[PDB]
């Protein structure tokens, strides 16, 4: 079967700056219900600090992939297991601040 997964981009704080519309089938929100908010706001409280430290590390890892598992609160207010795979991008023609590219998949915890 096709996994459900959407792409997002974030600043280094965690704030959603771009959300791919496949987010509707994955977590149930419209992209504009996510844009401008921190991904940590949709995260389970036992998982928030791991996710904040993941965002902090991914920038130190030279564009390599960092992956994290956490519980995300769907528009049903249900806790979905997400595997988020992330990496920095920084256009080497510029010295603009890197931002974080994410793929986000509902996976099984088992």
């Amino acid at each position: 079967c096709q996994p459900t997964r959407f792409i997002s981009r974030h600043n280094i704080e965690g704030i959603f700056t771009f959300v791919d519309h496949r987010c509707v089938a994955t977590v149930g929100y419209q992209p504009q219900e996510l844009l401008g908010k921190n991904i940590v706001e949709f995260c389970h409280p036992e998982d928030q600090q791991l996710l904040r430290d993941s965002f902090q590390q991914v920038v130190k890892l030279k564009g390599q992939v960092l992956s994290v598992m956490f519980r995300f609160r769907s528009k049903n207010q249900e806790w979905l297991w997400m595997r988020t795979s992330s990496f920095t991008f920084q256009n080497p023609y510029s010295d603009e601040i890197e931002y974080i590219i994410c793929t986000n998949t509902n996976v099984k915890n088992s």
Binding site: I7, G63, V65, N91
Partner: protein, 106 residues
């Protein structure tokens, strides 16, 4: 003069190089609608003279997990060719797809 940012778009691909997703931004820059790209191999879009090099970039990507394409031409929706440079990243799960960050040079 468009920005570096306004000339960057993402795409996602299955392991055979077919598009599974593209930013709407590609329309403004190259003319394609993402929905017409899905299911087509990226290979269909390379200028023949960049082809063998993109086959190599793809090989470095599958084996190393990440690659910087170096300069290539993509056929534009309404004729001619745009210059791009792409950063590819393979997302492995527990290979599941390729993420591409695409920058339009020309």
């Amino acid at each position: 003069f468009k920005g570096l940012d306004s000339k960057t778009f993402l795409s996602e691909h299955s392991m055979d190089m077919k598009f599974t997703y593209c930013d709407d931004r590609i329309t403004e820059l190259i003319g394609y609608h993402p929905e017409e790209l899905l299911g087509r191999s990226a290979y269909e879009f390379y200028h023949a003279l960049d082809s063998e090099n993109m086959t190599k970039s793809h090989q470095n990507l599958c084996t190393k997990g990440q690659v910087v394409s170096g300069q290539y031409r993509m056929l534009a929706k309404h004729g001619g060719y745009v210059w791009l440079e792409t950063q590819g990243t393979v997302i492995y799960n527990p290979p599941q797809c390729i993420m591409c960050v695409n920058y339009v040079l020309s």
